[PDB]
Design a protein around this ligand. Structure first.
Ligand code: 653
Ligand code: CA
Length: 223
C-alpha cells in the first residue's frame, strides 16, 4: 500500500496473508473455512495466516492453517486478468472471534464515489521496494467507469472497476494482490492489477466481486 497508514493490530480481522515461506498475497476470510483471493496468486503449498498484524513476529492471535484446495475461476485469463478470483478452502475451520472474523459478500454492486478500505502488506514505495512488517490501510473511492476506461483503454472488462486517486501517491501495489476492498462492510473488490503503483492517471484495478456472488456460493456449496 503506497500513501496509506498503519491500520492498527487486528483492526481488519478478515485480512489474511497467503504464505509460502514468505508473504506473497493477501486474501479475505468469508466464512470459517473459506478465503477469497486473486487467481493470479495461485500456487501450491499455501499456508493461510489469519489474525496477523506483524507478519515477521508471532505476537499472539495468529492461526496458521494449510489450504486443502484452491479453486481458480475456470474462465480466468492470465493475459487480461479477466475473472481474477480464486477460492481457498482451509484444511480446518478457523476459530472466529473479534480478531479473526469473516467479511460479508455484497448483495448489490457499489456505485462510483463509494469510499472503501483497501489493506495489505504490499510494497509501500511507487519507485522502489519497501515491504512493511505491519498491515497498512488506505481509504479510496471507486471511480466512474468512464474514468477507468479512459485510463486503461481496451483493458477494462465488466468484471473490473478502478478505485483510487488520479493524482497519484496513494494506491495498492505488488504484495497487496488478492486482498480486500471493503465498502460499507461488504467485500466489493479484490486487489488485481495496475500500471506501476501510485502513478498519476493509472489507478488500481480490482475484481468486481458483486459479479461473482452466485459463483462463490454455488462453488462453496458443492465443495
Ligand atoms: N497499482 C496497483 N494498484 C497494483 C495492484 C496490484 C498489483 N499487483 C501487482 C503485481 C506485480 C507483480 C510484478 C510484475 N512485474 C507481480 C504480482 C504477483 C504477485 C503474486 C503472484 C503473481 C504475481 C503482482 O500482484 N502489481 C500491482 C499493482
Ligand atoms: Ca505475526
Amino acid at each position: 500500500i503506497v500513501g496509506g497508514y498503519t491500520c492498527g493490530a487486528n483492526t481488519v480481522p478478515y485480512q489474511v496473508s497467503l504464505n509460502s515461506g514468505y508473504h506473497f498475497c493477501g486474501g479475505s476470510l468469508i466464512n470459517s473455512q473459506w478465503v477469497v483471493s486473486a487467481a493470479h496468486c495461485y500456487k501450491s503449498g499455501i499456508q493461510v495466516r489469519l489474525g496477523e498484524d506483524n507478519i515477521n513476529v508471532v505476537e499472539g492471535n495468529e492461526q496458521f492453517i494449510s489450504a486443502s484446495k484452491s479453486i481458480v475461476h475456470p474462465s480466468y485469463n492470465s493475459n487480461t486478468l479477466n475473472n481474477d478470483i480464486m477460492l481457498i478452502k482451509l484444511k480446518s475451520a478457523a476459530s472466529l472471534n473479534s480478531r479473526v472474523a469473516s467479511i460479508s459478500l455484497p448483495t448489490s454492486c457499489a456505485s462510483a464515489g463509494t469510499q472503501c478500505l483497501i489493506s495489505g502488506w504490499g510494497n509501500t514505495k511507487s519507485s522502489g521496494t519497501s515491504y512493511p512488517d505491519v498491515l497498512k490501510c488506505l481509504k479510496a473511492p471507486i471511480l466512474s467507469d468512464s474514468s477507468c476506461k479512459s485510463a486503461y483503454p481496451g483493458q477494462i472488462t465488466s468484471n473490473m472497476f478502478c478505485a483510487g486517486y488520479l493524482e497519484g501517491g496513494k494506491d495498492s501495489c505488488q504484495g497487496d494482490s488478492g486482498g480486500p476492498v471493503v465498502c460499507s462492510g461488504k467485500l466489493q473488490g479484490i486487489v488485481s492489477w495496475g500500471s506501476g503503483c501510485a502513478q498519476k492517471n493509472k489507478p488500481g484495478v480490482y475484481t468486481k466481486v458483486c459479479n461473482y456472488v452466485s459463483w462463490i456460493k454455488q462453488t462453496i456449496a458443492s465443495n
